[PDB]
Amino acid sequence: KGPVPFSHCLPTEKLQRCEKIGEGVFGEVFQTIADHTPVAIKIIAIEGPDLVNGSHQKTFEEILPEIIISKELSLLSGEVCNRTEGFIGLNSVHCVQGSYPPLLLKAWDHYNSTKGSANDRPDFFKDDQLFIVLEFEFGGIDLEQMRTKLSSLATAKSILHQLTASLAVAEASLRFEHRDLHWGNVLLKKTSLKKLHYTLNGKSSTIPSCGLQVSIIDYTLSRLERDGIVVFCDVSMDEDLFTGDGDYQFDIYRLMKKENNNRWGEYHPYSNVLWLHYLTDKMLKQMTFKTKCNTPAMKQIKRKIQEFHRTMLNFSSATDLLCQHSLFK
Numbered sequence: 502k503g504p505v506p507f508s509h510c511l512p513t514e515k516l517q518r519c520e521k522i523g524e525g526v527f528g529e530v531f532q533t534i535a536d537h538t539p540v541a542i543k544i545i546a547i548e549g550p551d552l553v554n555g556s557h558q559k560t561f562e563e564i565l566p567e568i569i570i571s572k573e574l575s576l577l578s579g580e581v582c583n584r585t586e587g588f589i590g591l592n593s594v595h596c597v598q599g600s601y602p603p604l605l606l607k608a609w610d611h612y613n614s615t616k617g618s619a620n621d622r623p624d625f626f627k628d629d630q631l632f633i634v635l636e637f638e639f640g641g642i643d644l645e646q647m648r649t650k651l652s653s654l655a656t657a658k659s660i661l662h663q664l665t666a667s668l669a670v671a672e673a674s675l676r677f678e679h680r681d682l683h684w685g686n687v688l689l690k691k692t693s694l695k696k697l698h699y700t701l702n703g704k705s706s707t708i709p710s711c712g713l714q715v716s717i718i719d720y721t722l723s724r725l726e727r728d729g730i731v732v733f734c735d736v737s738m739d740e741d742l743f744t745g746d747g748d749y750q751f752d753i754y755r756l757m758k759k760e761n762n763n764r765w766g767e768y769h770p771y772s773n774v775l776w777l778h779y780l781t782d783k784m785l786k787q788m789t790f791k792t793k794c795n796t797p798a799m800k801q802i803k804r805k806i807q808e809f810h811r812t813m814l815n816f817s818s819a820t821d822l823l824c825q826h827s828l829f830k
């Protein structure tokens with residue numbers, strides 16, 4: 502069908518309502534509103550020669566795995582045996598050709614002025630520039646931003662239960678490893694549903710939401726397969742990824758590489774356990790809860806999560822943890 506213009510994705514009224522909501526080396530995320538509902542639009546420059554935010558642009562061959570992975574995981578919400586809504590919904594994906602829209606520069610500048618940006622102002626693109634535009638269902642606010650905003654340790658327990666279940670269903674269905682599930686990639690949004698549902702290998706179960714619905718995002722480093730065909734990001738030659746410091750996060754890259762002996766095509770669902778450990782660590786060390794752990798029931802949930810932190814690395818997959826760990830019984 503050949504690339505489409507930016508107007509195909511952002512008709513004039515959608516485009517007028519865009520406000521920037523996040524960024525990364527990858528590019529830019531804008532929020533717009535259709536039918537009274539927000540959506541998140543990730544715009545990623547590809548195939549061009551310009552350094553963009555200090556890195557070279559991905560080729561189509563290079564951006565395809567994130568595209569494939571985002572579709573697969575979204576489609577889990579419509580499956581039967583292995584079903585979950587725990588990954589971000591993908592409304593659409595297009596390949597767009599043109600220079601960056603002036604109205605998006607406007608929103609970008611407003612962000613820079615109010616929040617600050619690490620990014621180059623994206624105003625240097627020519628009319629042949631290619632982009633991948635991923636429209637996601639709006640997932641809420643990342644766990645790092647919600648650091649100080651979780652009600653209780655029951656909230657933290659629901660979040661870890663949701664994440665474990667999501668990863669398990671994806672493991673069973675797609676032999677999925679997220680491989681970069683830092684706390685910027687766990688989004689939280691209010692839900693009025695008391696219980697959330699997933700189905701794992703045909704068995705349906707429920708999770709108390711504690712008023713939040715968790716969505717997993719960012720598949721830039723992820724791996725999965727369908728019918729024996731593997732899709733992944735080969736970081737075996739990447740130096741930088743495994744020489745970070747200052748946070749347990751950066752240990753996880755090193756620990757994954759130890760587990761997989763630097764063979765990123767292979768399937769090692771222990772990587773999901775590593776990430777869930779990192780996340781459990783954040784829950785217990787870097788969250789300021791809005792309420793106090795001042796009841797016997799809340800004290801017990803705290804001990805359970807501390808037990809989880811101390812034992813979870815002795816399980817083989819998110820599936821194993823979810824099926825066998827005492828925390829979820």
Ligand SMILES: O=S(=O)(NCCNC/C=C/c1ccc(Br)cc1)c1cccc2cnccc12
Nearest residue numbers: 522523524530541637639640641643645683685
């Ligand atoms: O606007 S976003 O980029 N919000 C998620 C990331 N928020 C910034 C966190 C960055 C970050 C990066 C690394 C670490 Br470690 C911690 C935080 C964003 C990206 C993709 C899909 C989205 C769906 N709904 C809402 C937002 C969506």
Ligand code: NI
Nearest residue numbers: 505509593595
């Ligand atoms: Ni279209």
